[PDB]
């Protein structure tokens, strides 16, 4: 039954690999979203300061 043992273990290894790859994919996506949101805040700040400048000008 040596092959059944390893069959079960390699399938478990497969599942673990899928789980961590998916977690890494989530990380990559979250980090991209994080950059997009940061940039959105940067644009909000830009618009606010640009508006004060033009008002004062």
């Amino acid at each position: 039954s040596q092959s059944q043992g390893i069959q079960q273990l390699l399938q478990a290894e497969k599942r673990a690999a899928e789980k961590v790859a998916d977690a890494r994919k989530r990380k990559a996506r979250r980090l991209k979203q994080a950059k997009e949101e940061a940039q959105m805040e940067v644009e909000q700040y830009r618009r606010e300061r640009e508006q004060e400048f033009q008002s004062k000008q």
Partner: protein
């Protein structure tokens, strides 16, 4: 000294180990993803906010 039932128990035990590690790894990775999300957001937003203030 172990029957088919016991060898199956041992196989299930090993699989349970593999699954537990898989779950802990995935959770740890997701938590780190959340940390890096906030870290990168801060770095980026402050970097460009600073640039904006300087142009202002």
């Amino acid at each position: 000294a172990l029957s088919d039932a016991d060898v199956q128990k041992q196989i299930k035990h090993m699989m349970a180990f593999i699954e537990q590690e898989a779950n802990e790894k995935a959770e740890e990775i997701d938590a780190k993803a959340e940390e890096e999300f906030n870290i990168e957001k801060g770095r980026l937003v402050q970097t460009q906010r600073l640039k904006i203030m300087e142009y202002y």
